[PDB]
Design an enzyme around this catalytic site. Sequence first.
Site, PDB file in Angstrom:
ATOM      1  N   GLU B 357       0.779  -1.316   0.176  1.00 21.65           N
ATOM      2  CA  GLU B 357      -0.116  -0.083  -0.080  1.00 21.65           C
ATOM      3  C   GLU B 357       0.883   1.258  -0.068  1.00 21.65           C
ATOM      4  O   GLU B 357       0.590   2.333  -0.785  1.00 21.65           O
ATOM      5  CB  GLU B 357      -0.861  -0.053   1.086  1.00 21.65           C
ATOM      6  CG  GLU B 357      -1.767  -1.145   1.161  1.00 21.65           C
ATOM      7  CD  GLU B 357      -2.650  -1.314  -0.055  1.00 21.65           C
ATOM      8  OE1 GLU B 357      -3.176  -0.215  -0.574  1.00 21.65           O
ATOM      9  OE2 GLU B 357      -2.897  -2.230  -0.535  1.00 21.65           O
ATOM     10  N   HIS B 487     -15.509 -10.411 -12.366  1.00 21.39           N
ATOM     11  CA  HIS B 487     -15.138  -9.478 -13.046  1.00 21.39           C
ATOM     12  C   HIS B 487     -16.064  -9.504 -14.362  1.00 21.39           C
ATOM     13  O   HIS B 487     -16.243  -8.523 -15.049  1.00 21.39           O
ATOM     14  CB  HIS B 487     -13.540  -9.639 -13.516  1.00 21.39           C
ATOM     15  CG  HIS B 487     -12.717  -9.513 -12.217  1.00 21.39           C
ATOM     16  ND1 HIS B 487     -12.526 -10.147 -11.410  1.00 21.39           N
ATOM     17  CD2 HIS B 487     -11.871  -8.366 -12.357  1.00 21.39           C
ATOM     18  CE1 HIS B 487     -11.655  -9.548 -10.494  1.00 21.39           C
ATOM     19  NE2 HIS B 487     -11.332  -8.557 -10.967  1.00 21.39           N
TER      20      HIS B 487
HETATM   21 ZN    ZN Z   1      -2.480  -2.536  -4.797  1.00 23.57          ZN
END
Ligand code: ZN
Lengths: 190, 596
Positions: B357, B487
């Site tokens: 992150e 998806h």
């Molecule tokens: Zn990521």
Amino acid sequence: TNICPFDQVFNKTQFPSVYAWERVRISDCVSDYTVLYNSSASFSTFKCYGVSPTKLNDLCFSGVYADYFVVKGDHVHQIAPGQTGVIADYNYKLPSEFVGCILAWNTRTIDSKRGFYYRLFRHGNIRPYERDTSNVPYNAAGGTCNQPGTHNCYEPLQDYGFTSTSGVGYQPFRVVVLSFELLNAPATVC
Amino acid sequence: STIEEQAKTFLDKFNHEAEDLFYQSSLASWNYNTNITEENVQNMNNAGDKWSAFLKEQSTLAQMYPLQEIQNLTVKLQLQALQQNGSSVLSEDKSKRLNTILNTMSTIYSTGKVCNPDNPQECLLLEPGLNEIMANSLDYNERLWAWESWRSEVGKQLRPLYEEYVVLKNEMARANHYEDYGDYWRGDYEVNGVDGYDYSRGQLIEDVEHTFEEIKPLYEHLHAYVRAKLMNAYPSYISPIGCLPAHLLGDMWGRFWTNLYSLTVPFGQKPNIDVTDAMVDQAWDAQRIFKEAEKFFVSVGLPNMTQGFWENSMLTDPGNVQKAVCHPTAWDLGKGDFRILMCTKVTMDDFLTAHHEMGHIQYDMAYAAQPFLLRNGANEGFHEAVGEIMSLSAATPKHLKSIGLLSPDFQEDNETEINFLLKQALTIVGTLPFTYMLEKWRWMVFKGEIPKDQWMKKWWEMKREIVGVVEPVPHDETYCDPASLFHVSNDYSFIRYYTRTLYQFQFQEALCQAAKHEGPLHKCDISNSTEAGQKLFNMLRLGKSEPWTLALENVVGAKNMNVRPLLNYFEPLFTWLKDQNKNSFVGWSTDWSPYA
Ligand SMILES: [Zn+2]
Ligand SMILES: *[C@@H]1O[C@H](CO)[C@@H](O)[C@H](O)[C@H]1NC(C)=O
Ligand SMILES: *[C@@H]1O[C@H](CO)[C@@H](O)[C@H](O)[C@H]1NC(C)=O
Ligand SMILES: *[C@@H]1O[C@H](CO)[C@@H](O)[C@H](O)[C@H]1NC(C)=O
Ligand SMILES: *[C@@H]1O[C@H](CO)[C@@H](O)[C@H](O)[C@H]1NC(C)=O
């Protein structure tokens, strides 16, 4: 001789925008600059042009001005003799033979509100020490428009969105500019 | 005077005016994600629609500056972005019909449930339940029930809706000067106007197939080894020359093979590396995890976190009565505001994803000086690849010794080296055939070379030839199995996962040479290397202002994607796999079937 009004203009309750700067005048007084040196760590910028920063207290001038306004932290480097930017073109200009000092500090907890504006577009650069306070729409192909938000017509004032959560470069700064005149004349400020 | 001067004025008011609105809209989303109330959502709805209504009005008068009279490239990129008609080209009634179709797919997938036989009262869902079975069950007749039932109740109800989804969205691409919907998604890799860097939309298909033809020799050897070990678990259900049934891959769709590690461990007597115990003994907290990861980026030359990052971010579960969403994310609120939302725990899994992150945040700082419309990665697969390579370096044993988590008395043997690679191979290599086949099936359906009466017939013909997975139960034309994935049903492109894997090993190989690394690629660490950071920072600060072809050349010295570095990372595993299948068959025969 009485004491200079520097502490009454260096600490006020409200400051104006860059497009409308004040010109409080200092004359017929003695001045002490050691007050601006004790609180030296509170200033993020202390630049003096023409005169030395240290050992300027023992100088005598024929006239001193003072202009104060609020500008973002990304436009502070634009206040100097010689620059183009956006402030140096349409908001505040300094002559190339300027002599004086420039001061700035962070006021994130006071001036963090909507109400501060600046000019974006105009027709031509302004002269040094010029004040413009018009609110008329602008166009990129002619003279004056009568409908902002309409093709080729633009409003020239943009708001300085001030939030305490934003970054350092987008946080409010208060700038006070001192101009010194050193020509042949009776001494006013010493 | 000219038409370029009036176009720069429009790109000078918009940048200062759009940034103000984007900050307020992103500020309301943060409050809801950290404080769940029925009043906080009102602010997001009120603020978000203001930004949405701002873009269409601004883009309306951006179409009146033609693109054939501008020679400055940085202005054409911004003008083309704001000149996109989008879904606004369709009629008033056709746009609504498309919109309600999409909301139906999201609703049915999220609220789908299956009720078991002999118990008509209590039913089972997916997010918990069906998953647990496809991750922790070894019964052949129990996995088959969960696999078929979900596709029989959820997939069957998506068949009529998906047919309209193709036809209503193909015409949107046709009106936008594209021959089909598949070419819309392929336009993210298009580069025009630069000599020596052009990349046509149709070249993505040729390059993907060209790179995949060099992956099969590695994939077949791993496929054969997994098949041999899986015969032990299920006595009389697998053939030594056939394929693998679709309900025995450790997950519901076969996307990843990670859950098969228990049944396919090469050396089971040697445990893996876990430093969770060492962290809790030293009283590590949430703050320490993010403090250590920041030091990693400073060593390579990249800058450190801002003051507002520490005062404003959320790194611990609020507890008490305040609620929040615990998905780890990286935020770029605007005006120099960056935060991280995370419900951190003192574990090894949370230590690695902190670097992932924080790697995203470093990218966002690099292109903050770029214009507003050019603040993103080079393409859809660049942002994720940067974060992935940071977690690879921190997971190395040598790095863990430096930070004091693993004792200096830890000896690495060749047995544990193979164990680490196989775990990585079951996640990275195993998903490559799945991603390549699904996107190819979607591409050819949009072009119309697969008739509506052969959708399922060609779905399993490509499965047995490229992926080598056979169905357990025959599936006729009334099934819509590909729609069972998140998806596909929720209209997300899938080719970004194929390119991200290839990009992330080109970046790693180039950066290891800058650090003067000797040995196998899986032990390379980029810590304390300024040259690697300087090479990486050149790409990061470009943003979208330059073609992705040139941005890739700044790091790896090449203009096209390559697969050779991927095989270098997994080369030691290749040699060991060959020595295992000497007395066995490599490959599969398509004629086999478990139902005949
Ligand atoms: Zn990521
Ligand atoms: C107000 O500001 C002036 C200069 O800016 C300073 O000299 C004065 O001490 C300040 N007032 C207080 C109470 O500190
Ligand atoms: C979270 O929202 C509630 C709404 O009732 C409010 O009372 C509370 O102060 C909020 N928490 C914070 C930290 O602002
Ligand atoms: C595009 O315009 C910018 C304006 O600053 C200029 O700096 C840049 O060199 C121009 N690029 C081209 C294509 O000349
Ligand atoms: C980054 O690290 C340098 C060196 O320690 C330090 O001078 C600088 O203030 C740090 N910046 C921040 C805000 O982390």
